[PDB]
Design a protein around this ligand. Structure first.
Ligand code: OGA
Ligand code: MG
Ligand code: NI
Ligand code: ZN
Length: 331
């Protein structure tokens, strides 16, 4: 078996190998990359997502989210308080202000220490889940707006045509902005490109060990656990690397820098934080190996997790037994 210790692998495709997305994902998996739950792909040196980022300031963040923490430094939840709309220009100015800017630090490790020590005492503002793309329409390789759709994948594998579309989202981050522990909707893959700015640190649990993370989460967030049998779908719980180590949860960490792709694999729990002002783009995707994960994905039916139009069809076709109850939560 390749990559038996489930280490995060880093890939360096040639421009030639960068031409066929599906084939390269399949190549990564042949080398065991999926075992980690997360891989990094450094694009060929000749590749660019677009010519410049000079004209992005007028993108609107219609609902910036202030991420308010509760709990203890290593074990907390976060809630999103909706803020008034602002442009990316305004947001970047806010990110750079004395109140929100990245503190002085030695290196990524020092900044990670300061994150876990101090996150809970600040409420950074996250421009998340903004439908759109920063890829130039003339970028032909690994253009997150031109991937094949999950609906087409299901049709090709399963022969059923379904409604739904699949489009990317932009994330504008600042220091301490945080993504809670989660897998993707329907345990899909995700791909994330860091277009610009400061890094993003990721933590990930190997898919083969996800249930160990879930078990610890139920012990650490016991009221959440009683409220819903899949509360990590709410995307609100944080658990520090220290706490995961204390409880013997296998995980890995890696820092993504501007110009790099990350791929999360089905049922790879991940969480992380942004180092400073940045802009990422991400989209879910599927492969034939995903199908079985989609069939087994947990679902939130308590009504908190409230997800996209397109997830309906996935649950309807892959999880017909769940469908009724899950849709009661959706409506
Ligand atoms: O970048 C973020 O804030 C969160 N991104 C992801 O969870 C992802 O790409 O799967
Ligand atoms: Mg603009
Ligand atoms: Ni994710
Ligand atoms: Zn729920």
């Amino acid at each position: 078996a390749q990559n038996p210790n489930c280490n995060i692998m880093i890939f360096h495709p040639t421009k030639e190998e960068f031409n066929d997305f599906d084939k390269y994902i399949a190549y990564m998996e042949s080398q065991g990359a999926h075992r980690a739950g997360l891989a990094k792909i450094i694009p060929p040196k000749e590749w660019k997502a677009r010519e410049t980022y000079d004209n992005i300031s007028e993108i609107l963040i219609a609902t910036p989210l202030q991420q308010v923490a509760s709990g203890r430094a290593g074990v907390f939840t976060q809630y999103h308080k909706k803020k008034k709309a602002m442009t990316v220009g305004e947001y970047r100015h806010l990110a750079n202000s004395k109140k929100y800017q990245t503190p002085p630090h030695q290196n990524f490790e020092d900044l990670e220490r300061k994150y876990w020590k101090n996150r809970i005492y600040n409420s950074p503002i996250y421009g998340a889940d903004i439908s759109g793309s920063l890829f130039d329409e003339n970028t032909k390789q690994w253009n997150l707006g031109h991937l094949g759709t999950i609906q087409d994948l299901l049709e090709k594998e399963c022969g059923v045509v379904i409604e739904g579309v699949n489009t990317p989202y932009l994330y504008f981050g600042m220091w301490k902005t945080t993504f809670a522990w989660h897998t993707e909707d329907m345990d899909l893959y995700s791909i994330n490109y860091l277009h610009l700015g400061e890094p993003k640190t990721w933590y990930v649990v190997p898919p083969e060990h996800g249930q160990r993370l879930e078990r610890l989460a139920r012990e650490l967030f016991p009221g959440s656990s009683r409220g819903c049998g899949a509360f990590l779908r709410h995307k609100v719980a944080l658990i520090s690397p220290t706490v995961l180590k204390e409880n013997g949860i296998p995980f890995n960490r890696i820092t993504q820098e501007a110009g790099e792709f990350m791929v999360t694999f089905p049922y790879g729990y991940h969480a992380g934080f942004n180092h400073g002002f940045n802009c990422a783009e991400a989209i879910n995707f599927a492969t034939p190996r995903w199908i079985d994960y989609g069939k087994m994905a947990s679902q939130c039916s308590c009504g908190e997790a409230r997800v996209t139009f397109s997830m309906d069809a996935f649950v309807r076709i892959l999880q017909p037994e769940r469908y009724d109850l899950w849709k009661r939560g959706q409506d």
